[PDB]
Every structure is written in structure tokens, then in C-alpha cells.
Amino acid sequence: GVEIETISPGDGRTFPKKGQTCVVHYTGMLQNGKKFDSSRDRNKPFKFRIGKQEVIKGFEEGAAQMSLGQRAKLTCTPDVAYGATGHPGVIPPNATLIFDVELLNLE
Amino acid sequence: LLLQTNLINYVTSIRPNIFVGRAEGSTQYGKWYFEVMVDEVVPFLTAQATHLRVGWALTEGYSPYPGGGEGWGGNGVGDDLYSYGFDGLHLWTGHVARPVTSPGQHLLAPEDVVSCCLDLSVPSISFRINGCPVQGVFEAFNLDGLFFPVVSFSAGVKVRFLLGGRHGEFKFLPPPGYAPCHEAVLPRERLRLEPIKEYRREGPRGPHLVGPSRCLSHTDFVPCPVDTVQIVLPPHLERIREKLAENIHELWALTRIEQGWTYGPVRDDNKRLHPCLVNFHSLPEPERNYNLQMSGETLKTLLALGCHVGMADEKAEDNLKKTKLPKTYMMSNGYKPAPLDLSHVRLTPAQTTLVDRLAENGHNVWARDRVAQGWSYSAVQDIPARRNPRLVPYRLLDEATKRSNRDSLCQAVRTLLGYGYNIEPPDQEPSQVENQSRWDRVRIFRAEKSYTVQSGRWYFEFEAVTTGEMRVGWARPELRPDVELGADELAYVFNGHRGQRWHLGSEPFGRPWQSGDVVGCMIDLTENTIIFTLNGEVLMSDSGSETAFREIEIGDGFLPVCSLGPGQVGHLNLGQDVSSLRFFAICGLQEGFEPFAINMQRPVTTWFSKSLPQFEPVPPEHPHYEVARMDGTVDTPPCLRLAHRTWGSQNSLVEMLFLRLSLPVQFHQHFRCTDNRDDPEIILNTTTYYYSVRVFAGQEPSCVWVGWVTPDYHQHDMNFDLSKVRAVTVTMGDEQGNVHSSLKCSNCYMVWGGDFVSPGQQGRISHTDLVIGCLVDLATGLMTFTANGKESNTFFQVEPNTKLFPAVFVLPTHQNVIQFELGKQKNIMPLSAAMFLSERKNPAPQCPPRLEVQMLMPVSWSRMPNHFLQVETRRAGERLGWAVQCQDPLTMMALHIPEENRC
Amino acid sequence: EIFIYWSKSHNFKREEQNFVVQNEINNMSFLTADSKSKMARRGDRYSVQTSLIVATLKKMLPIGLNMCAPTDQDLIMLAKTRYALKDTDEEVREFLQNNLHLQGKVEGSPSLRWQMALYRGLPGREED
């Protein structure tokens, strides 16, 4: 349900394994092109712990398939996203998400 | 519903001054090639991704005004249909990104090679990354206007232009048939890098407000002479058919005798010893009588131009003699002047202008002939490739060649004048090169409305860098943007192109300026006067009055204002720094006057008239047009009837009109896989919506177009037809052909109403109103039409996420023109159930007050951003090419209107 | 002072227009000679607006306005109103001597700050 397209490849060798936290500069967007979330706007990296599922399934799996230094784009189906209930007041129900993830560092 | 906000980066564009295009009989080669080197690219200079695109743009609608615009701002290449661009992963056209397969695809990184191949013979722009092909080509695009290279970028990039020859290296092999773009430079201009259409540039003592720029046209590359065939040769001309030929048989030979190119009996012309001053009998017969009938041909050009001859005075044959000068002495059959000799003879300016256009009509016939033999223009001469540096029309030729052509025929017309035969000027007809776009001529500038003054005395300066049509004065805050200053009562302005004062008309006052003049403008809200002072000297009326205007009512108040015509540069100095003023101490300081911005920290905000058409609602007070809302009865759906208020009367405005509804319809994100009683289980599940327009009787269907427009339509054409509709095809395949995607992109999808009427003998005023209906399927993006209840062969398919505004373009020809009927069809929902979310399950038609008709206003006001990007344009070297460098980031807070998709 | 005498002597005014009408003094060319040289009814017979005494007075007025400092504007107002109350030149002079300290203050008005910053930047200004 998650589709990843490269934007600017990094190393392609060191992949995020379990036991090391992932550090990202995502940039979330709705399907129609309306930006809804960003990390550079807050001007701080988003260190999420991979394995205990602090993020949604689509984002977790997409960040799993990336590599160090790689900048990629995602496409999160509602099945692997917030889904039928959505995120109240932020994301409408049954919405496909797009993320401009850059995996700048590991831990 | 709610207006959204965001921080976006300022995006600018840079072009080489290279202009190519295709036209019937155009002197330009239809294939060109240029390259771009990427030096450094900062990934995320700010919170938003750094912008960088390379492509081709069209000179008649690619207008990248900084700040707001289409979509979420930062518009550059590909954000409209007048540009086509590539960024390393997407093909940009009409503000839509489409992914492209590439050999190791990524965004533009440092040390990357971008080679854009342009073919105009067949519509095609091909991109090559790092010398490797990119599987996508734009096709079937309109050719009107000129195509030029352009790079659009945000802050923090360094890009180099490679143009081949001495202006680059290309670092690769261009595909066969594609000439380097540096060979298209016109002979009168050098190569330099300058931004696209602007309104401000930095200057020595301050920013310079720059008026519209004169743009070259493809029509200016076709040589159009006057035909010299259907001319019976007159008796008075055959009577002088000989001497005017004898005097031009070796006139080009006279200059070089007694030099290194001195004749010899063994050889003849074209053998580096050309002259052969003896006679044309010794010279070959075909070129001989060719020279005779070329003299006749020049006389035929004189006839077609309007020159006729008359004999008055003493015959020059008697009082003329041949002078065997010590120079031009030859051993081959005696010595004589190479042309026929002539004594003291003069020429009036009428003859100077006439010989100028005579040389023009010689050059344009020569160029026409060369083109008919296949030749074209190239700044470097290539004889085996059949290209010349002088295959441009005379108006575009260089002054050296202009003088060289004019010299010979000036001698010829001088010899004609010597015999006393009059050179009669023809009648004078005033003509304008471009007439339709009357709005892309001026560009009003004024301070923001908050700086309105209603008391005291104020003063400001306006340096006139150029000497053309520029007007400066004071205006009331509600000044219209599309009306020339002074032509209405909203502004008091002084036009110093020829010394006139404008307020509800023009009358002479003062004197016109020259370059470097500082037109200082007073204002006295107590004494109710406006005083114009030039270089410290008060401009004086043609009477005892020294004040341009008097007894001016206060009203809302006044704002400093100025406007500039094409190719004009003016410096406006409101006087934020008092010591910067050059004539305040001379005039104004002792009179109690003050600078307009004497005590202000930030620079005064300036608003200019943007020349970009926008859809705006129909004013209720409009003189010519009105829109009536009709209530939906039991048997009639609700309507939006349009009626011409002043039709058939004096001073009726009859011109091209563009209309659209205020609310769009958006197709579904995901397309689907692979009596008169509506069916209740179909009417709830249908994804088809219908609307119809009832073109009233007396309105000609030949001037009516009905359909839909996307929110990025910005074309104001007074001669609109379906030809002018912008379009482009995006063609995608794999590495070896195999095209598996060919889509259509356009900002306009309408049919022509003239094609739905049977071609009757006469009586185009049909007693029955034409009811053009339109249908849309939001689940497929398919559009259909019904001429009178019967389907038409036309059909349109569009990509998802598309917004379509119901639109009608019409030229009024009756009191009642059209009537938007918001009805419904069988098992088909109305529009009112499509535009409103809460109405998705209501078959009953509605016309809620948000739904209204809007016209297309050609000119609208706008705001000049307080800070502009810093771009360095310089030539790095002979091999490196031209380097563009922008580093300092700028961010602006954008307010984006959702349903109009513009910020 | 020539204008002062002309204003006081209304008899001299009477033969000013008498000289104008009886010598056909147009007065338009005397002010538009520059206008004609630069290539740019109602009161033609006589008018105060075209009187050469006031026309030259106006054309010389900025020089006279250049004499005083911007803080002297209150002093000008005081002298003006005492002139309006029928006082001679000596009276207003010693009135100013009694009111020497009534000049303006630059701290009290922001206008005077830029006025002094422009007025005292002149090379011909002496601070003493």
C-alpha cells in the first residue's frame, strides 16, 4: 500500500535496522497538493523510534526501505494511514498521503 | 472554505537574449540547441525545497511577476502553458508535474548536464540529462510568438549557460540538425543575460521603474516587399532606361581602382582584380542586360512605391562631362570613370527616405529569394550549410550593411535627380505595428492607499531617464488601472513627452523634457494647487498662470503617481532621505513644502498595474453589461441571463467578452477502473453533471463558445477563436520508443457554437434559441456536449484533480445574448449538486447567492514586493560560459484562495 | 523696501497702472521671455498679478526666505502680527529684542530636525 520513489539518492548501503532510531526531515502533503505538515517549518529533526510503531504503518515502512542520506517521496494509502477516522481537524477521512522524507541521519 | 497561508520562496527567471520562431517564409532555422551546467545547489536553503527548472518559454504570455500567482506561488518555467520545463524528475507545463524515467533519475544536483533540443518544424522539445535521453517530449503546441531559453530558480543556485561556439563548449555532441543557440543572435545586438519582463531594476541612486519592453516578433523575420511584377514600364522610364544602368554597371567597381584590386586585361570581374571600367560590352551579356533590367527593376520599385518623374530644367547631358582623373587610369582600352560621371548634384530628405525604403525593398527581395532557395540566418557564415549573417529583414540588419546598400542606390537616385526628373514622394499613411494589445503599453505606478494625504503641502521628484511617453502627477486613491491617466477625472497628471497637462483631456503646458531631467511635483492642499517644476524652474502655462491646476477639491485625497510607456525608464524619488533630493533646496524648501516621505523608516509601498487578465465579478453598476438572476419556476430551471444594457444605441461597447461562473467543479481523485422520470437508484449513484446555455435569438452563434476553463486561463484576445486555445501533448514512452502515454493539457475546453447550426441559405437569426448543453463525468474526466439534445462528435478527456469553471466567450450582437440555465437531464444531477458538498444528494436545481457570473478584466492592480532577489549575470569565461548566481534567501507569506487556485 | 513704499503709497499705485495703460505695458512678455526662449482678455490692460513690482518681489522672495533659521518662524509670526497692529520697523525690532528667547526649539518638533540638518549643511552658513 506504500509506494516510494527516489528524489535524491544517498548511499543505498546502510539501511535502518532495528535497534537504532531514525532521524528524518519529512514534509507531509495531502493528495490535492495542500501541505499539512512539515519538520523544517518547526526547524528540528523528527527522531522516531523504529520497531515500537510511534508513526503510522505507511510512514514506518517507507522510512524502513530508505537509506542514509536518501531523499525520497512516499504515497501512503488510507489502509496504512489514519484511515476511516482520519486525524480529527487535520486530515480528512480516507485520504492518501504524500511525504517528502529525507533520512538525514541514523540516531 | 477558509483562506490558507504559508511561507514561500521568491522565484525568478533568467534568459539569454536569443529569440527563435517559426513562420511562413521566416528567415530562421527551425532547430536549436543549448546547454546548462549546474555548479552548486543548496538542497533546502529555507523550509521549502529549492526550485530550479530549465526550459523554453513563449514571448507572448510567459510573464513571471514575482510573488503571488498561480497555485502556491513561486511560478517559473512550466507553471503556465506559455512555458515548458524540466527539473530532473518532472515535465512541467500548466502548473502540473509529470514523472519521467531517466538513466539514474534525481533532482538537479551539482555537475549535471541539461541539453534541451528544440524542433519547431514538427512541434517537439526533447530533454537530455548528462548526455542521456529523457523519455518524454512535448508535442502539438502552438507556435505563435518566439521561443527562448529560460532557467527559473529560487535563491542559492549557480547555473551556467553553454551556448556553443565561443559562448560555451556543449561538453557533448548535439544531435544532428540542431544548431547552437548562439547562432541566432541578431546582428544589431550582442549576447547578454537579462531577466524576463520586469517593472523595476536597480540604479545608481535608486531603483528605476521600468515600463513595458518592446518584444520582437516572428512576423518581423518575414521579408515582405512590394511586388514588382504587375507594372507596365512607362515611356519616360524606357527613355531613361540606359543612363541609369550605365551609371550602375561599374559603380561598385569605382572604389577599388588604383588599389590592390586594380584590373588587368588578362582577367575579368571576381578575380581579385575586378574593376574592368571599360564598358559592359566587354563584360558578359547576360549579367549586362540583367544590370539594365535591374536599373529598370529599381525604377519599377519607384513606381510601386509611388514615385513619378517630370522634366523641367536644362538637360544634364549637355552640362555633364566625363573626367579622366589621374586616379582610375587604366591601360585596357583607355581610362574613364567606372560608372558614368556626374557633376555637382544634391538630394533632399524626401529622396533620402525614399532611397532608404528603396534599399529596404531590394534587401527584402534578395532575402526572400535566398529563403526560396532554402537559405537561413546564422551569426557565423556557413556557405555549404547555406546560411548567412545577413538573412534578416532590413529593419533588423546592421547599420554597416544598411549604409553599404544605401550608398549605391543613393548614387543612382542622385544621377536620376541630376537629369532634373522629379522624385515625387507618395502619400503618407500612418500605421501602427501592434494594435490589439492596447493594455500592454503603459504600466501605472502609485503609492499605497494608506499614504493618502488630505492637508498640507507635499513634494516629490521624478527623474526621466528616457525621453518617451511618461506621465507624472497626483491621483485620487480609487484610480482605475486600465485607463490612461488624465483621460478621467481621477488624476491630475503632466505628460512631458510633448508638454501637455492631462485632466479630463489634454491642453498644452510647460515644455517637454530631455534625458536626466528631474520633474519635481508640488501639491498644495490648502491653496488647492498643483505646481510642476522642471530642474528647479517652474513650468509655465501659455497664459499668466504659473500653476498647472487650481481649485482642486480635496475629496478622498491624493497619491503621487507616474506611468511609463514602452521602453521607458524613470526614477521616482518620494524623498525618504531628504538630502537625496536634488532640487528641493532650489525649489520647495523655502516655500514651506515638505517631501512626501520625510519621516518614514520603511520605503513607501508602491502598487502598479499588473497586465495580467483575471476573472472578476460583474459590477452591479456597469454601464454596458448586466446579469439578471432568474428564479426557477415549476417548468423552468433557475437562470443567469446576460443582457446588453446599451445595445443598439450611441456609444455602445461591442467587443470580445469572456465570462465564467464563480465556482468550479473538481473531478474525482481516482478515476474508475477500465415521462422523463429519473431512476431513483441511478440519480443517487450517477457521477454525471449537466448544464445548458440558451443563446437568445438575434445573437450570432458564430461568435459564441461554450464549455469549461481551468483556473489558470489568462488569455485576453480580441479576436478569439478555437485556433488561439493553448494546448500541449505530453508524450511518454520507454528507452526505445514504445510510447505508452500521450496526454492533453489545455486551459480551455469549449466548442464553437457556430458549428451546431445547419448552414441555411439566409436567416441566421433563428427563431428558436440554440441550447448548448455540456456534460461532465467526475469519475472519468470525460466531457461531452449536446448541440440541441443530440450529441456532438467532440469529446474531451482530462486528468484527475482538475477544476473546471463553466465559461462562455461571446461577442454581443443583440439585447439579450445568453442565459445560463442550471437545469438537469434524465438520471443526471445538476451543477448545483456538484459545486456544493452539502448538496451532493439533492436533484432539485438551486442558484445559491455565491454562484454568479464573472468577466475577465484585462488589467488589475498589484503590489511591488519590498525586496527583490539578488542575481549575478556575468560571463565567467570563453569556455565556462555565462554564470548566474543567486544566494540570499527571501521569503514571502502567501495567502492562497482555495477555489480559485491562486495566491 | 521699494515694495514697502509702493504698498504704502497708493498714489504711486495709481500712476503705476496709468503708466501701464498709457505706454501699453503688456507685462506678459516681461515674465514669459524665458518661456519663449526655452521653446515651451480679462486682465490684459492691467492686473495686480502682472505688476512687475510684485512679480520681481515674488521672484526674489526665496532668497529673502533663505536669511532666517527655521526656529525663527515664531519670531516671523510675532513680527507679522505686530506689523498688522500698525507698528513701525523700529517698534517690531525692539519687540523682538524683548522677545529674543521666543525662537523655536528643535526638540519640540521633528520637522525642525530635518530642517536644521538641511539648512545648516549649506557651505555659506556661519554658526556664529
Q: Which residues of C touch B585 (CB under 8 A)?
A: 118
Distance CA B868, CA B195 (A): 12
Residue B469 sits at the vertex; the CA angle it makes with B467 and B470, to the nearest 5 degrees, is 85
SS (H, E, C) B491-518: EEEEECCCCEEECCCEEECCCCCCCCEE
Q: Does A41 reach chain B within 8 Å, measured CB to CB?
A: yes
Q: What CA–CA distances, in Å, run from C94 to B120, C69, C76, C86, C104?
A: 91, 19, 14, 15, 19
Q: Strands B517-521, B532-534: parallel, antiparallel or unpaired by DSSP?
A: antiparallel
* Cell of residue B833, nine digits: 449538486
Q: Does B89 reach chain A within 8 Å, measured CB to CB?
A: yes
Is B136 exposed, middle or buried (CB count within 10 Å of its CB: 0-12, 13-18, 19+)? buried
> Helix, strand or coil for residue A16?
coil
Judge: B511–C38 Cβ closer than 8 Å, yes or no: yes
Closest CA to A22 of A61, A77, A78, A74: A61
Resolution in units of Å: 3.4
For B363, the enclosing helix (H) or strand (E) is helix B349-372
B326 Cβ contact list (under 8 Å, min separation 6): none
Q: Strands B639-644, B625-630: parallel, antiparallel or unpaired by DSSP?
A: antiparallel
DSSP B603: P
Q: Which residue's C-alpha cell is 556557405?
A: B383
Distance CA B264, CA B268 (A): 7
Full DSSP string of B633-677: -SSS--EEEEEESSTTSTT-----EEEEESS-EE--SSPPP---P
Q: What CA–CA distances, in Å, run from B698 to B701, B759, B812, B818?
A: 9, 16, 9, 10
Distance CA B219, CA B227 (A): 18
Judge: B7–A31 Cβ closer than 8 Å, yes or no: no
DSSP B750: E
Contact B118, B56 (CB under 8 A): yes
Judge: C35–B579 Cβ closer than 8 Å, yes or no: no
Distance CA B429, CA B328 (A): 45
Residues of A carrying an active site annotation: 26, 36-37, 56, 82, 99
* Cell of residue B363, nine digits: 534587401
Distance CA B146, CA B143 (A): 8
Strand-pairing partners, residue B626, are B643
C 79-108 near B (Cβ less than 8 A): none
Judge: B107–A8 Cβ closer than 8 Å, yes or no: yes
Q: Which residue's C-alpha cell is 502627477?
A: B473
Closest CA to B226 of B350, B391, B351, B368: B368
B 782-841 near A (Cβ less than 8 A): 801
Contact B241, B295 (CB under 8 A): yes
Judge: B4–A34 Cβ closer than 8 Å, yes or no: yes
Q: What CA–CA distances, in Å, run from C85 to B871, C88, C89, C92, C94?
A: 67, 10, 12, 10, 15
End-to-end Cα separation, chain C, in angstroms: 27
* Cell of residue B2, nine digits: 477558509
Q: Which residues of B touch A8 (CB under 8 A)?
A: 43, 106-107, 109
Distance CA B427, CA B511 (A): 31
Strand ranges in B24-163 using DSSP code E only, listed in sequence order = 31-41, 52-58, 83-86, 91-92, 113-119, 124-129, 132-139, 147-153, 157-162
End-to-end Cα separation, chain B, in angstroms: 14
Closest CA to B388 of B768, B852, B27: B27
Contact B613, B559 (CB under 8 A): no
Q: Which residues of C touch B590 (CB under 8 A)?
A: 61-62, 65-66
Experimental method: cryo-EM
Closest CA to B90 of B107, B114, B103: B107
Q: Which residues of A touch B109 (CB under 8 A)?
A: 8
Contact B233, B300 (CB under 8 A): yes
Distance CA A25, CA A46 (A): 6
> Helix, strand or coil for residue B71?
coil
Q: Which residue's C-alpha cell is 493618502?
A: B452
Rounded to the nearest angstrom, the minimum Cα separation between B369 and chain A is: 53
Contact B96, B745 (CB under 8 A): yes
DSSP B684: T
* Cell of residue B398, nine digits: 546592421
Judge: C111–B544 Cβ closer than 8 Å, yes or no: no
Rounded to the nearest angstrom, the minimum Cα separation between A43 and chain B is: 8
Strand-pairing partners, residue A98, are A29
φ/ψ of B99, rounded to 5, equals -65, 150
B511: nearest CB among C40, C110, C117: C40
Contact B813, B699 (CB under 8 A): yes
Residue C81 region by backbone torsions, left for phi larger than 0, else alpha for psi between -120 and 50, else beta: alpha
DSSP A58: H
* Cell of residue C122, nine digits: 549649506
Q: Strands B31-41, B113-119: parallel, antiparallel or unpaired by DSSP?
A: antiparallel
Contact A67, A12 (CB under 8 A): yes
Distance CA B55, CA B85 (A): 4
Closest CA to B196 of B455, B443, B15, B352: B15
Full DSSP string of B83-103: EEEE-SSBEESSS---B---T
Full DSSP string of B376-429: EE-SS-BTTTTEETT-S-GGGS-HHHHHHHHHHHHHHHHHHHHTT---------
Distance CA A53, CA B347 (A): 95
Q: What CA–CA distances, in Å, run from C37 to A5, B518, B520, C44, C117?
A: 77, 20, 21, 21, 37
DSSP B154: -
Distance CA B854, CA B627 (A): 9
Distance CA A44, CA A42 (A): 6
- Amino acid, res. B310: G
* Cell of residue B229, nine digits: 511584377
- Amino acid, res. B337: P
Closest CA to B280 of B323, B243, B317, B255: B243
> Helix, strand or coil for residue B558?
strand
Physical contact, B and C (3 or more Cβ pairs within 8 A): yes
Among the residues of C29-109, which ranges form H helices?
29-37, 52-65, 73-84, 89-98
Burial C89-124 (b: 16+ CB within 10 A, else e): eeebeeeeeeeeeeebeeeeeeebebbeebbeeeee
Judge: B4–A43 Cβ closer than 8 Å, yes or no: no
DSSP B723: T
* Cell of residue B274, nine digits: 575586378
SS (H, E, C) B138-150: EECCCCCCCEEEE
* Cell of residue B609, nine digits: 498595474
| Closest residue on chain B to A39 (Cα) | B47
Chain B neighbours, 3+ Cβ pairs < 8 A: A, C
- Amino acid, res. B811: L
In this complex, how many residue pairs, one in chain B and one in chain C, have their CB atoms less than 8 Å apart? Answer: 38
Distance CA C39, CA B781 (A): 69
Distance CA B345, CA B681 (A): 98
Query: In this structure, how many other beta carbons lie within 10 angstroms of the beta carbon of residue B249?
Result: 23
Long-range contacts made by residues B129-133, C-beta under 8 angstroms, separation at least 24?
B129/B88, B129/B102, B129/B103, B130/B103, B131/B171, B131/B172, B132/B102, B132/B103, B133/B103, B133/B735
Distance CA B213, CA B441 (A): 9
> Helix, strand or coil for residue B457?
strand
Distance CA B429, CA B210 (A): 31
B195 Cβ contact list (under 8 Å, min separation 6): B12, B13, B14, B15, B871
For B883, the enclosing helix (H) or strand (E) is strand B881-886
> Helix, strand or coil for residue C3?
helix
Distance CA B288, CA B809 (A): 61
Distance CA B410, CA B247 (A): 12
Closest CA to B703 of B760, B764, B758, B647: B764
B340 Cβ contact list (under 8 Å, min separation 6): B243, B246, B247, B322, B415
